[model samples]
Target: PDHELVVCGAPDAAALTGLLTRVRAAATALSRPELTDLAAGLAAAHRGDVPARFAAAVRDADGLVAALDRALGHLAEGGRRLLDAGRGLFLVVGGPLRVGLLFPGQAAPVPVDTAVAQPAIIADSLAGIRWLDRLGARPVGALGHSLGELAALSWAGALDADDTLALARARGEAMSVATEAPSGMLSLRADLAAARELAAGTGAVVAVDNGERHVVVAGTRPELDRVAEAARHAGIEATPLAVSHAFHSPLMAPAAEALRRAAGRLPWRRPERPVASTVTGAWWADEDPVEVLVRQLTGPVRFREALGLLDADLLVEVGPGRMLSALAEAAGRTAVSLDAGAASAAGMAAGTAALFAAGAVDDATPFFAGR
Candidate 1:
């Protein structure tokens, strides 16, 4: 909260395109014409040489594309013995939010491997502060959703977890996973077309993602959801989402509109490391917030593709839940999952050992520190 922290430190630029593709494609599909231009810019960047800093990043993008192509090729073949041929392990999983939301009040924890989720070295619980000092060399990350994102961000030094959580708890913000109603908030979003149409007209737009439902919006919360509520009030099966405001979708368009003006006045600082965007899936140190944030408002979730773009020996999630870990598996990341909030600290230690034993990571302290 005091200083801006680098996310996913020193991310290779080559790994960006896969994520760019997903976001760009979705941005293009939306009615916003500017998004189409943004997609084209990234496409152009993909075809040429990137600055030296982003050179390796460009390569990662190529690798992810190849991996995706091969995976698709196998799928094209009906996956009838891709496993028997020793191609690789195969799995098909539904979206985590779907299963988790459908079964609220159930435990669904994920590893805190991603830098954005930020793992803490010190613990306020029985684990104690010196525990992180004693970690020696272990990668720690958080899997945060809803307010959990705030938790993960704090662990990552984006905020202070204990203080923030304490403050939030005082405000009656307890950790309770609730279902979504808008854009399949409480239920599965079966009508993406209708959602998109609503997004186009209002500042709020709900992206139908298997990741987090009713996450992003470009429209105004009160004005937009009011319309939805009005419809439901009139006998349509409308549901109100438990979330306070629409994020990343059209419903939050006003937010984007406001952000554009705010970003124009804010001083930009260089980041120590790369931070991947959930909206764009690319890592950048410098950003033109006005245009980019607007696009992000109506963009797609491409964190899944971002994983494929990485060549890291391990894929650790940095949030409160195991959601990304499962996504890593779906994206073919071979890293073992590790969660900071696991039943015990010993499990975290053992999970790291198992990752090395399984050959997903070498003995590198940076992996633990996320440097």
Candidate 2:
């Protein structure tokens, strides 16, 4: 359909009233007030005080029952609450919402340690894709941030999940001890041109162009600090990333070489779904995944450009957090990210609900039909 009229309306207030009461009581009974806030969201949605309905680009639902499934599994009350929350979302006939899967980089903080972040990120990312596929929210392409390239490749069918995880492990181990010098990356609230101008003669280089004036510059501590101070002087914000080493910089060369040898041992395949590379800011065709991933270690991330190439109706962060999702939004694209609870079965249920609502996925019959 060309257009869909989706009203962000709530469900039956009476039913919601009861659901809220039950969920609220359950929240208190569970002794987790966190869930009570959740109760309130239901109340708000049911009250119609919130927007009636919303529309997303997706063409699609179900399988979120895993996390929410597990959360609800032990406590059917959780299930009922989500069942209500997922209400009023799929009220509309939808679009063939072009969706793009995104993976997060290791440099960003995650639930797991950075040393193992790569595998964790890919695992979550792969799970998301699998669930999406099962539910009918399949993406046509995938891409990612610095280390996220590996996840992107994995999603593209270039590597199986096991190979992806092994690569992630080796990449992480290699990067953790790659450099002895005190160096890190800095977030520059400036466009690439502005960042280059700011970093000139400062020994820092643009490691990533996240689009919309958000850039990452990496170098030794002194150089990074200098750029930070200069950025402040020039009326820009600069924050230090909580990373052990300056990734995507010359400093990563040693680690890159280390990962290359390991990468050669993996089985690489042509992507079933096209994959975009932030390293080169284009689609991956003839370029080998191993070759591209190795270059990703010390190459600048042209995420801004990749977004252009993989332009889709919505961007979904296939990992645990909203970092990559936020980047997609910053670039003026519709984006979705599963919560930290996303790793949990409860999160899977709610996330599926969310995806359904966003129109990223297509059916909820399986989810609702299941016991």
Candidate 3:
């Protein structure tokens, strides 16, 4: 045989099976015959007939429609319960984009180097926004953590997706080139006061104040160890982060200048919606993009401060993981994120339910119509 490369695998089949498993679990839980039948139909179909089978199942099943309505009703009730408990939904974007190996149409995991990660994260965050839009969650305001600020700005109409991606790429490239030493970050579970005290005598800088008791410190390995020892002495926990450089510290000054230069080349626009800055913990209005972004590199991410300033009926983490949502909940705020179980559908359903319960919108008409 000639040298012809051939690869064999059923990754797509595996993914489909996983999706069906989730659907089956949901149907079984609710004892919904239509959903079960639909699952069965898809399971029994020939590879090429799966879509047609699914379409037929959806098109002809009254039970399925009823089940959907019932599920939506249950979601509404839950949201109403939360609202009655005096909670609100706030839209919070995610940070540090990472993708799964089998997400959607991917044959393999997306390879994200530092330069590539910037654009990839921006695109993923935007995709989350699009999902929220389709789900009819009309956000009153937006907030982002660390790198998520870029995505938040794009969502708020200050910059288009293209410009955001471009700027992120430049940021990553600039940061990558600026690092001359082998450095990293450490996450510490300590109050800001404790964290500040520990950093005062050490070379570590408090890079991110994630919440009441969560902070990230950046420094070289030796300096980080010293901080960790100090944290242990103070009865606090410290965990090292898997990062390539010490970010949001004095170490990033070179990167800051580089980003400033890169940002100057892009066109700037005014934000249509309020965007809380992680650096300043305040809404940015009519600021120079280059100046603001440059400061973002060397400035600590005041995420706790930014989150505190949001006034919303609900807080929804618009990205993949529930990290931001979890932090929001820990701070006594009502929050939700894109559910990993049902993927985008669950996130959209939850968002729509929240909006409907908040009385911010009339009904779930947008949801069903979009579907």
Among these predictions, the greatest lDDT belongs to: 2
Instruction: State the lDDT of candidate 1 residue by residue for 1-371, as single tens digits.
Output: 11110011012223332443354234323333343234234333332222211110111223323433443454455542111111112212110110100000012342232121212321221131123324332332322322232233333343344553343332221111111423323222224444454445444545424332222232344545654754454443445544443444444444444445544553433433234444444553355534554565446544433333344434444323345555555445443333445554332433333332222332313223421
Best by TM-score: 2
Q: Which stretches of candidate 2 lie over 4 Å from their true place?
A: 1-94, 107-113, 340-360, 365-371
The regions of model 3 sitting more than 4 angstroms off are: 1-80, 83-112, 339-344, 359-371
lDDT tens readout by residue for model 3, 314-341:
6756555566766776678776554323
Q: TM per model?
A: 0.38, 0.72, 0.69
- Model 2, 21-134: lDDT tens digits are 344344332322333334234323432123212222111112211222233242333322222322212221223346677778764445245568777766777766676767
Candidate 1 achieves a global lDDT of 0.33
Order by lDDT, highest first: 2, 3, 1
Task: Report the poorest 10 consecutive residues by lDDT, candidate 2.
Answer: 56-65
TM-score of 2: 0.72
Q: Work out how many backbone clashes candidate 1 has.
A: 64
